[PDB]
Structures are given as C-alpha cells and as structure tokens.
Amino acid sequence: RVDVMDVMNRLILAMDLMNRDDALRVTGEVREYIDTVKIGYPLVLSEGMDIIAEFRKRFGCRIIADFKVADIPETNEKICRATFKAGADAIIVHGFPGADSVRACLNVAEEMGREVFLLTEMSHPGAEMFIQGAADEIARMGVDLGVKNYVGPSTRPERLSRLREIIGQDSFLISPGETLRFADAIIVGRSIYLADNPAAAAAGAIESIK
C-alpha cells in the first residue's frame, strides 16, 4: 500500500540490546537486509535518546520507538513530541488507556509528519488477565480514530486474521510464514542479534520470506 511505510524485505529488526556498542555493532552488520529498526526503553534509557539519530545517520534506517506510551493525554503528547524531536519515525502506543490518550499521540504525529502504531494486544502470559479481552475493542477504537498502523500479537495465527478483519486490508500491521499472509512485516530480534553472525542470520530469515 502506497500510503503506509515500506519496510525493506518485510523484516523489522527488534534491536533490544542495551549497550550502545553492541547495538550499533550487531545492527551495522545487517543494514543491507533491513532498513527498519525497532528500539525500546532499555537501550534509550541506558544510552540516551541521542542514539536514535545515531542509528538513522549511521545506517539510514527508519526508527520505530517501542515506548508503549500509556499515560494521560497531556503527558502522551509530550512523550511523543520528545521522541519525534529525537528523530523517531514512529512510536508504538497502548490503547488500553483509551481514545483521548491515543488521539493525543495522533495529534503530535500529524503535526510533525510522523507515525503512530497502535498496540492492540500482547502475547505474554499475563496478557490474558485484561489485555486479551480488550483487544478487539482497542483495534476498533483505532479504526474509528483513523489509525493506519497496528502492532499485533506475537502468536496465534487466527488472532492476526481477526485483527486484519477489524482494521481492513489497507492498514499497516506488524507482528513478531503464515504471519505474512496477514501482517505486512514481521519483527525479529533474538534470532538475529544473538546470532553468531547476524549478517547471515538476517539473510537467511529474508530468504524464508518467499
């Protein structure tokens, strides 16, 4: 789809290493295969938000800030603004705090020409308690607000089909084979960044992608 982001090879690197040297080292090796990297709080809190601009300049990659934004609207707006100012192309935002909290993020993204990803569900065991039961309604909330980018559940193929049904065929969906029948790109972390040679691990994972 022309109006949503193009992810090279449909593969997003989850760069979850927490020290700057390792993160830049392991990543550098793969920029030929990947142009989109997801970074989270452990790295940025440990090394500083300046690491975002460093990735983009050293690798020319798109950065998604996996910050799972989950505050009140005013604070969400400030988190998004600081994150985009640091150069993030996109930010991942929880839906469970409701529509106004999401809209605050969308407002800043529109102003700054950046993107918001709505996190509709999570896959860890604790997610059954409250998140699983809210997932469909959160996805619908996103659609109703004009959200165009979604992050779906790691596992359960049939959950992706359901999410894809709710959000429509045009919106952008990312998830951790069968998966790419519903998601537009897959997120891969450990398989690559803890590999003996990430360069080859990336290349192999990409071969698997049709």
Added chain:
Amino acid sequence: RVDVMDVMNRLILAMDLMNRDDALRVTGEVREYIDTVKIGYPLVLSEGMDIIAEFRKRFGCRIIADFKVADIPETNEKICRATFKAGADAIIVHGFPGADSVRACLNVAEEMGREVFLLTEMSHPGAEMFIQGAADEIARMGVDLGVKNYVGPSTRPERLSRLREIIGQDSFLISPGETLRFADAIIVGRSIYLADNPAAAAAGAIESI
C-alpha cells in the same frame, strides 16, 4: 507505617517541566518543604536519565520514576533495572498488562532494594473505556502479589476509600484534604511549579495539610 516510605509533609512534587534548568530551578526552591519528587518521561527523555542522580545530589530528595511501565516481563525487568541503576528510589508500573509483568518489576526492586508502585487506575476521560472497569481487580492483583505501594485515581473520594478497602490499612497510597483520609501523601504539580513563588506555593499547600 514504619515499613513504607516516609514522605516529608505528605506532599509529593510532580516535577513535570521538560527542561533541566527550569526543573532544577523550581525544585531546589521547595526542598525545604518537599523531600520526594516524581519525574516522568518528558523530562528524562529530553534531558537524560542522569538528571535523576542530579536531583538526589542537589536536593537530597527521593525520586519516584513515573514511567508507567507496561511491557512484557523481560522488558519490564530491563526498564526497572536501568531506572534503578540511574538512582530512582521507586518506579510506577501499570497493572493492566497482568501479574507476570508486575512481578518482573517486583523482582528487580527486591534485588536492588527499591520500590514498585502499582498504578491501579487513571482519571483522564479515556480511562472509562478499559481502565476503570479493571481497577478493582488490578488492586487485588497487587495485594495478592505483596505490592505495598499504590497510585490511585486523581478524582473521586469514594474511589480512594474503595482502593484503601482493597489494599488494607498498612500499604502506602499516593494520589493527586479529604484525600489524606485515605492516601498517605498527595501529588501536586502545576499548583506549585507554575507558581510565581514555588517556595510560597509549597508552603501554603503544606499549611493546608
């Protein structure tokens, strides 16, 4: 209660300013009145996590990191570890992602001798959609996990009494007069940091306390 934190004057400063100069300027001027300061992501993302150690050294204050931690367990562990390593005395964690995500935080806090606050509910309009309906169960989850520190709803007195009922009389509860009948300390932000005389605004808030 001896086994939970003593907050000076029962008043926590929500230092929500985003630039280091302003944040430090306003805070120093109230340290006589406040010994506990809550800081969030806008400041730390803008200025660096080193600002936490700066607050503690310049003012001798306790720092609560209002990071609303809301990830999977392994990532929560790492967020907490980085935040405590930077010097935070406590961290505020969401309960909606479930028990294992909260436990991950509790594990690191116990290891490092720090504290976890469970956020049981939020007060912004959107909180009605999913958070309000989960609040009692989240509070009970905390109790069942041995959580001793809670953050409650800004508004609605009767919500605080309900929370206090669930968590028991000994756990520590903070919230944004009637409030201190149920909460152990109140969180105050704009009233103070957007005041022409923060020193005076703090002093008045403390007098009314």
